[PDB]
Amino acid sequence: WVDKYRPKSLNALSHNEELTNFLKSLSDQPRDLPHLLLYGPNGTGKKTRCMALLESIFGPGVYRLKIDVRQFVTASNRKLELNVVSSPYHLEITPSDMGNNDRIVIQELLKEVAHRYKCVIINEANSLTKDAQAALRRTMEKYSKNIRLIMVCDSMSPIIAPIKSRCLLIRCPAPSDSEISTILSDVVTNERIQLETKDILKRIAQASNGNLRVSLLMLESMALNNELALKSSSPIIKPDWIIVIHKLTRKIVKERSVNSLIECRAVLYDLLAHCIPANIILKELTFSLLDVETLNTTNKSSIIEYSSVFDERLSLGNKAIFHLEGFIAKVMCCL
């Protein structure tokens, strides 16, 4: 399992040695530490490295944490309920658990909270609205001797420039397939899995695209289908939504009409209704449509242009299906 085998310190990290050394350098003197922003691909291990860095800044009790609840009152009598992950040395907030009320929670909670300082971990800073980021802009600078922010995100694209300047930027590159294979080897020798040939582990990496969280989960999922004994040709366990997207692309390249557009809209609705973001849906749909060998360069260029345009539309809109169906119709018109 991902959680049973996870590093708890900086000396327990097993990939990106230069990043581990940079973290040790940054944690050598912990009091004169500026705000940090960990950015990189999703599933690389930045949330583990931030906790490992906190374990170097403070005692080992940083992992002994508790979940509490805090209530807030907006301009109306609608009560905002937010759970907080707290520790005797730091606290974690995730403003991605609500709508446009991120600014209120951010400002009030950070003002109440504001070695000698208490660390703050803002999870998924990409969901932070521009108004919440503007509110945090001055809170980052006014209280710099009591509150230090460690913002974990997957892409600095939606982060405003003032926030980017107000904190150090640390990139976490996805681990190489060799390091993923070495980690899976230790996992299967500790979990007592039977490998007929080691190369299958490499293939797992080649199916994860640098994601360790996905790699270990897929390894464990396929270890339950092969009954704790992986063979030389064990099938690759793909998530359900990926299969739905692949079938959607097959339907797209097979039939291009309005009658098929209706069932495409139905599939998009069924995907969106089951807690699947539309940006990831669009990304996977476009990337798997480019993989269609039936199309040519002229089709793929138009497809990527339309996907960029409708990604901008979706980032500027709120009704996600209104942009997804438009992108699908434009792709149908292109092919």
Partner: protein, 457 residues
């Protein structure tokens, strides 16, 4: 509807021996309630009133949608059915909008009155040595298959009113006011008033002294071949502006356009309209940020549908619904389930919560967790390996705080299905075919997992 009006009169005349003691155990009609159904505005209420008055009854009307106190109303209905009115004429009860009664109080009272009268009649027929219903009841609905009416239907004589009666009524008013109105101008007034009887009478009185957003959506897909396209466009613009609800009209257009017939070359028309729809979504987001000067441009986006998809082929009205409110409520419910799972992980898994984003939880973690729980343990011959997997699954159920609840809502002592709380199934299972397969497999696994959780407890 003369045939229907004569049937109603025939049914009310069957009450005459019981009420008036006139010769055509009480010789009452077998069905004591008359149920009128049909479209709005066709005169259901007017026909009930005229036929009851023509039969010598005093008419008492009750709107069943407004009377939110059946148990209280009860006193009104009981007084109107069983007490003598000061009027010489027997009362006929007319209940309008009986399908609008969200609280079954009114209908339960009518059913209780009918059951009490059946018990009282059987005592008069078979009783060796109780208020009998002596007054007719007319009920009016728009929808016959409304769930509330299922209990009332067996006691009712059902009469369908189909889509002239307004013209006849207005002519009778004109003749009594000594107004010589040509029948053409009365038809034009009926068409102007859209079958509103109150508006018709007021417009007639004014002459004497001298668009549902759905209808707009269906009009936006229609082109009249006999009128200038520009005149049709300005008429539609004025109708969209007067309605003030451009958003609902556009959502209507968005639901209708895939089902509409439109000369298709490559389905590009839909690609051009996705850009407008995106323009509308940006405009609608900006309305909450900026003073509503931008509201004037909101009426233009629905008119792009008339330009692009308007065709002479679209003669039939397409009915519509609100998939978005249902999808928004479902998205809210699923987000609340996910937020509760994320809180449970934060309380138990001290480190897991730091690596779990809401999106990664929905798309990666929950589908694998459900596939692990739904796996067919019956294929595993090795008992030791089955026990080890079940111990790991019990540890996973504990890390995610997933409780196995015996839903004993079966009600007939056979198989109370085991359900996971929170229901991960509603978030993960998008495919209706996979739901049925997974439910049958899970029922046997969850009983084995519950037995193991109880053993561990």
């Amino acid at each position: 509807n003369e045939k229907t009006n004569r049937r109603m009169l025939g049914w009310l005349r069957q009450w005459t021996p019981a009420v008036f003691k006139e010769q055509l155990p009480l010789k009452r009609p077998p069905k004591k309630i008359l149920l009128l159904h049909g479209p709005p505005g066709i005169g259901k209420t007017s026909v009930a009133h005229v036929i009851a008055k023509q039969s010598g009854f005093s008419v008492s009307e009750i709107n069943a949608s407004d009377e939110r106190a059946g148990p209280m109303v009860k006193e009104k209905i009981y007084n109107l059915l069983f007490n003598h009115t000061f009027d010489t004429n027997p009362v006929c009860l007319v209940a309008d909008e009986i399908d609008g009664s969200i609280e079954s109080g009114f209908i339960r009272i009518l059913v209780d009155i009918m059951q009490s009268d059946i018990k009282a009649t059987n005592k008069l027929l078979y009783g060796q040595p109780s208020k009998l219903l002596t007054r007719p009841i007319i009920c009016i609905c728009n929808n016959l298959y409304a769930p509330s009416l299922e209990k009332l239907k067996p006691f009712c004589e059902i009469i369908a009113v189909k889509r002239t009666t307004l013209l006849e009524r207005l002519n009778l008013i004109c003749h009594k006011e000594n107004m010589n109105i040509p029948i053409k101008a009365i038809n034009d007034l009926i068409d102007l008033a859209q079958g509103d009887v109150r508006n018709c009478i007021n417009n007639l009185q004014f002459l004497a002294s001298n668009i549902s957003w759905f209808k707009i959506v269906n009009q936006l897909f229609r082109k009249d071949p006999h009128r200038d396209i520009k005149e049709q466009f300005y008429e539609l613009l004025n109708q969209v502006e007067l309605n003030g609800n451009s958003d609902r009209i556009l959502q209507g257009c968005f639901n209708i356009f895939p089902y509409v017939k439109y000369s298709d070359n490559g389905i590009r028309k839909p690609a051009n309209i996705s850009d407008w729809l995106f323009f509308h979504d940006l405009m609608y987001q900006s309305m909450y940020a900026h003073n509503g000067e931008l509201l004037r441009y909101s009426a233009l986006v629905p008119l792009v549908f008339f330009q692009t998809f308007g065709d002479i082929a679209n003669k039939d009205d397409i009915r519509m619904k609100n998939s978005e409110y249902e999808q928004r409520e479902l998205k809210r419910a699923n987000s609340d389930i996910v937020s509760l799972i994320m809180r449970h992980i934060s309380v138990q898994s001290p480190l897991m919560a730091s690596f779990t984003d809401r999106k990664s939880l929905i798309f990666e973690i929950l589908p694998y967790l459900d596939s692990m729980i739904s796996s067919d343990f019956n294929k595993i011959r090795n008992l030791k390996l089955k026990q080890a997997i079940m111990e790991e699954l019990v540890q996973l159920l504990k890390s995610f705080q997933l409780n196995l609840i015996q839903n004993r809502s079966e009600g007939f002592d056979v198989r109370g299905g085991l359900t996971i709380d929170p229901p991960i199934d509603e978030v993960v299972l998008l495919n209706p075919k996979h739901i049925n397969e997974v439910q049958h497999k899970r029922a046997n696994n969850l009983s084995s997992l519950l037995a193991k959780i109880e053993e561990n407890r």
